[model samples]
Target chain A: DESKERISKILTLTHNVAHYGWIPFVLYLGWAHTSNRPNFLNLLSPLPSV
Target chain B: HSHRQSLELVNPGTVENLNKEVSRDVFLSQYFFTGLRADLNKAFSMNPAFQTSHTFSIGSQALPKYAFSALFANDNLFAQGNIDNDLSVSGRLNYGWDKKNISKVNLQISDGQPTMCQLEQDYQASDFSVNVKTLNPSFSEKGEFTGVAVASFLQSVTPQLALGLETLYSRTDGSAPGDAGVSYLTRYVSKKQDWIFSGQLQANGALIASLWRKVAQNVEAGIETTLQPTVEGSTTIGAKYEYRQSVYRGTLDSNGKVACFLERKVLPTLSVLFCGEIDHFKNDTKIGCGLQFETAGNQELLMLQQG
Candidate 1:
């Protein structure tokens, strides 16, 4: 019971940080812009070589 | 200026961004690397979408050895900050005043290097797109402007063809004379909007042209060529393949360079990336391997994302 509670506490902290960070914010905009939300499967690097 | 409502027009995006799907997405110019890499991305939400990413790589000349990036966004706002082991910091923010007007800010700060910032405004209308941006704008004690400024307007001349122009002005120092240039660009899209052609004649006498075609529902191809007053110019042909569980991209260049990138999804939340390149004449080899894992914050999201 104590170990489960400890892991839960750590997970909450990590989730909190993730919820407030830059990547998530950018992804949020990306999701809204892409009618079909871009998936994690889409390659991240290799910005369009225009 | 105003006529038939039945004759509608569409925005064709920016001039410089033109036709880039094949070269940028399929050719692996920025995606190719010779190294081992790992990326971990964790997501905690879907509405106010949030995610954190960590990237680590070795034997890569350009990839950072270790870096962390975090992002948060609402429907109208986005901000990202990235820091590497070298302690360099880079950030970007984009705010949408309305659907058509967006202001973006980008900045970078690094050790032993000058900090830099850029600002831009992008406006899109039914028939055209306009943009203005400046990099590292500065003012001298005498109120002289010293920096780079660019303005571009692209308008659709017809339902399929669009014409545009890009103007640039820059000054290296307050005392230096400003330099200016104007470039012409054009784009043509087929009725299907699947095939596109873009061409640009630069102020310095460089000409570039590209054509992209969606061959099928799962295949795309692009061909591009550039010519200058001088002797150094090249053409490239590239293609992208989308499969049920993976993507593959390959490119061949007129200059004897060839490259390929593949991303294979082993699981819903895990993928493997491979990059390789070879010089047909120079006898050099380049390759890279990477793994990506995206863990969802909730089981509901996990099930939703695994489609």
Candidate 2:
């Protein structure tokens, strides 16, 4: 639940500028950061809570 | 009280051609200034400024010996200054083409051509010159509009000194590389105290080049000041220095330029202006000057003013 919450928060912050600021930030980020979804998921595997 | 409205006419002489207004076409290009006519000759009788007000001219030249021979042409149309203190507007047009055509000729032989004919000689291929008659894509056009508005005594800052502001706007179309944005400039002139000082600020719109998610934008700005010296016969000379800076979006590309100008009025109806400027951004120097003639009762000036 904590990892999922963090993931949701990251998504919100990352997408807010694109939606509200009209920056085209999402397209640029996708071009630079997103290669394959499976690989991206593996890289961002959930971390254990303290 | 002398009761002398007498018809005594003191001739002020023949108005000997000590100085005259310069022509606009002469100042269209860049050149150096060193001697008396360094900027432009100030001695002439007929001041084109008075009768004509503004002038425009177009001319062309031909190159004979080249791959392709063609005529290179230029067009410039602009108005001159007038007594009403109005700004000047101008435009420039240019056309050019390649003048030569070259082709490869191949000569193949099994052996050699001879004085004493020892082996087989073959002149397999030959080529001849033909008038291809070509032009530079036949359709390339560059046009620009420049407007300069001069407003004097916009405000009085002091007893001997006052403030003046001038505005400049320019737009270019069908440029080779790409389209440049509209440019704006505001200049403040102060002619109080012992010297004349002026300052100006310019803002240019962004020239954008976008590809998918990546984009590039460019903007430029400049400022400058000069020391004014008063001369005889409504003539003034000034030395001015200016600095220009440009910024590019995303890439953060920045560049600048610095230079100086000598402004002088060599005639009552004409102004001789010259400048020696350097491109700090590109590390190059440029020398240029303008000969502005002001005429009275001009129809063109009236129309421009109305606009």
Candidate 3:
């Protein structure tokens, strides 16, 4: 009711955020970011004594 | 802020571990397991950590004579699960959306087959690393889409070089239109980094090369080769020796076979495993023995796991 149904509801929410959140949200808005397993004490250890 | 905190960049990890030292002894027969085995781990809570495991086997036939595992990690979440011995079930989950993003999920339920899942993501920075995945990502019923997606990206063109590329996409039916490929990766390091080389080039014309060496101070070595165009193309060699408590790995292949794996540790949480394989043209032979024990649930975390 304000401008063509508010630009078609912002074009269907920008096509669902560019078809499901484009590339990790554009690398999460370009930064605003940053960033273990395999155990068994190296799968068994303890030797050298005969 | 001090010139972007002196971007000395360095995060060339991931990218499927850029040949962690050339496949680190190439899989060691999935870590040697073949008969007589036992494992028990408990650590029920460390600030939301939680843990559990109990594995037992005897004369393994198809392995997993029995199993049960449960785990949960903290500081960004991680989870795991396993249950085998007919009940068959698998699980995996992880999340750490901060510190460079991390996401993964995997599951499988068995008993007359059919049940699986997967999805992935791993993004790294400070140099480069990327991975995006999908498997069994479906959407049938004529909606169009039957899936498989793979991706990769490695970077760092210095600090001993690194370069990557890999991508694959597929679709099985919904009527035509899906197939993509691109592959290329290379890694090199030396200059007292103790040698390392990695390679890959494919999109069908296949080729893979590898080499790793350390030669002393716990010695190690590796070699690999693959060249394909439609058949026959193999070369392999592997070696690893980690002393100060035994460990050994060996592999040789080029048609015939020869594999070996060894482990030792008679205490300090016990350990013992051995593996073997020999088949110079089906002459046949196989051997493997296993045993391992590591426990801790208190007592100062088992005295901080022995020193």
Candidate 4:
């Protein structure tokens, strides 16, 4: 009964940390996908078209 | 007075008839510069002065069977001397009787040292030409010879396509075979002459390909890419875009670095240049800007009016 109790506590701590890590990871993914992709429109239109 | 002024003149063949046998022509050119600037206005008082920094150069060309020219800049100090065809004893004929064979030699001296010496020979026929060049055949401290030579044979396969082979030999490594390597070249142009493509392949696992096209009346774009197996199989790509009076160039490599250059001619004699680079992997960015100005003064305007 004591060993079961200790294993349950360790699992609970890991679950909490893993749940918190997703926030920053998801935010970084969103930023990279939207900001860093090469934009063809910007490349084509340098200064003025005419 | 708040501006700078300069004067320049170029008189071609102004003095002649010195030697009738040789078509002698004397050229004279000069430049004068003066600038005006006002002192800092202190308590409602202003003072202005003129500054002068002038430079002058003169050169003459004489043509007979051979061509000869000499130039002097900054008050009659000899700057450069050149002789073509007849005056150079190094000029030799390899094939004396072949109508399709021709050879020439060239030599240049600057600052009292022979900086460049070259011998070139070419053979031409109905559809192809073979040319060879030997540069700096001798070794010296002031002009150490690299011991390099090049030979190329080009065939006009068609009006729009031509193929050639180029071989380079270097003796920098004394123990090696001295056969630096060989590369094949292919040049192709579109029917409308609007697009050009060229490629080079080396014996060693390296390749270079380039393409240039005119997309619009005043727009041109080109891309060049190089691939080499020796450098961990990395590829580098460079691109250029030119429109009216502005040009932009950029390069990207496998290392996640991007570099860009921009140039624009704002006026007839004024231009601005900008450069930038970004290293995505390292999270670094750099930028630079510059400006250039040029003017040829009243004498140029007078010459234009007279013409």
Candidate 5:
């Protein structure tokens, strides 16, 4: 039972980590877009608007 | 754009395969799902080999994309994953005995429990190839005990001809003397590049012959016939026709079974498929239909960018 509980906890932690990791990524994206840094979406575009 | 869903029905049973791309170009990239068994009683009644139970599998792929993927199935089937790091260094960890290739020899290892470890190796150079495999089911429990081993070699005498031999040995657990077997295989292609013929002869007095040919521009046909002195031999003939985004296949076997499959692309991202099979001997019939849809995200993005 100890091993099973340990494995279950590890699985839960991994799932939470993967799920919440997107928050920081979105925050960084927002910071980069608000600042003077070039937008990541613009970099993906093939052409620039006048 | 990487997501896919498929449904297959075999007589009274149904199976589904579903997957979705959870993230893009990152770890935990996809979620895979699979389910088997729909009519428990009917499934087993129709086929004696069918398991009365059902199966459900859910798994995910980790970082490095296809290099690593794992899933945990029902019961103690844990840590079931694959490590395809490279062509030479690829293997899988499954619940039971599983083997993977290592250039010449493939090694098998059991997961969770220390049951057995096996090694298999196969090498091919030019017109010849050799295979060797060893199985020790109780190696972890009982050390240095010979289990079972198999070795086979094949040589292509010509571009259209080949020969092979295989042998098996197992006497460690006080069973019986090792047995040896030999086989012959040959293949020939027509000069017109329209027909291919192949046949095999086994040491146990069994022979199999098959022929494939392109009957027309978009039509192909093949026939296979087997002969054995100990069992009832059967023959199967099949043909396939393809025409602009549509394909049709029909097959008939000596066991009084006829099957047909048809697939038509109705839209740029949608397709419909239908399959029907009938067994005249058993008076059984099965019919199935499925729809497939593909996401046009990348193509639509390209169009928008161009416009």
Candidate 6:
């Protein structure tokens, strides 16, 4: 239940960013997802630190 | 590129001769629109009582030179879609030829498209040529044909130039039926149009050239006049010239009695055009202009320009 809530929170954030035309923020999230980096904190990191 | 390599293996002289012939033939197809307008008007005048006249024309040709040299003895189909309109599609295809220049026969087909005129509309028939030395600056010949079967000897002087003199006797046997005429407030006229079949033998000495550039970039300019050897039919005597700079470059051409189209590139894939022509048969003139936004890979397209 907690995981679902967290994912839903992330999806809402994504939808808001996309609907508001936040291209740079969406691009950052895309980079984070493709690089397997969970941006629960600052989404400014370029590469995942794994 | 394999075809290019194969062409490299062939004798340079042979490739030059083949290239010249194919280039000249393709150039002639681009110039076909000049007379198309005048012819359409003539067909319309025959039935002035009818307010509208709908006409259709079909033509085809074969390119043996390209098949033998570049396509390894393949036949190419050449065709013109509709030349009277401002915009139209014209293309050629190659087929059935071995690596050697020895090929039994060749085939070609072409469809003319409208460049500026509206879609699915007949512009008129003042549009749509021959020449030997002026065609290629190389060689020439003379021959004859009956109906659709043609038998003639095509000869050339240089490896990059050949002349073909052909006598083609053809009869367009088809009919258009209906009630079509224009009735004005002041004048009333009605006429039923019939399909008139006329036989003509056109003797032409054409020059073909093959250059190092893409097929569309190789230019051809020639002067040719047609006569009714059977009877004193419509004797079309005029000179037509065509030059292709490149894709998105610029083209200059004039179809002696029909129309002329000039296309120039404004951007990488955008082009601007100006076209104008006179239909001598109908005693009418048409002028139009438009732009084309191309979304294709790096390739050249043939264009029509009249002067």
Model 1 iRMS (Å) reads 11.4
Estimated TM-score per prediction? 0.83, 0.19, 0.27, 0.47, 0.49, 0.28
- Write the residue-wise lDDT of candidate 6 on A1-50 in tens digits: 69667976996685444333332333332333232333333222212121
Interface RMSD score of each model: 11.4, 34.1, 12.8, 28.1, 21.7, 28.1
Error of 4 at B62 (Å): 38
Sorted into a CAPRI-style docking class, model 2 comes out as: incorrect
lDDT of 1 by residue, B1-307 (tens): 5663456877787754785664575567867787999988866566776666889899987888999887767788888878777777777888999999999988776756766778999999998899999998877667788999999999988889999999999998877799999999888999987888889999988988889999898998998898883456889999999898999998999989888899999888789999998998988998899999887654566677786
lDDT of 4 by residue, B122-226 (tens): 676555677788876644344445667878777656667667777777665344445567878776767896877767786676876666666676555555556
Evaluate model 4: give its TM-score.
0.47
Docking class of 3: incorrect
Provide the TM-score, chain A, model 1: 0.42
- Cα RMSD (Å) between model 5 and the true structure? 17.4
Which segments of model 5 are wrong by more than 4 Å?
A1-50, B1-120, B133-148, B170-174, B293-307
Model 2 lDDT, residue A8, Cα: 66
Model 3, span A1-50: residue lDDT tens: 47656976996585444434433332232222211221344212222110
Docking class of 5: incorrect
Tens digits of per-residue lDDT for model 2, B39-80 = 111111122211212222112121111111011111211111
Weakest lDDT window of 10 consecutive positions for candidate 4 chain B: B24-33
Model 4: DockQ vs. true structure = 0.00
Instruction: Give the DockQ of candidate 5.
Output: 0.03
lDDT of 6 by residue, B1-307 (tens): 5754443321222211322322333233343332122111100011111111112222213211111001111132211121122212221122223332222222111223211111111111111011111110111122221122222223322223233333322322222221222211110011221111111123332221112222233343322222333433222212223434322222222332454555556654445555565656557765544444433111111111110
Best by lDDT: 1
Provide the DockQ value for model 2.
0.01
**Which parts of model 6 are misplaced by more than 4 Å?**
A1-50, B1-93, B96-152, B156-221, B229-258, B279-283, B288-290, B296-307
**Regions more than 4 Å wrong, model 4:** A1-50, B1-129, B139-146, B172-177, B229-241, B250-254, B301-307
Model 6 has how many clashing residue pairs?
76
Those runs of model 1 whose alpha carbons end farther than 4 Å from true positions after fitting are A1-50, B4-6, B303-307
Residue B185, candidate 6: alpha-carbon lDDT: 11
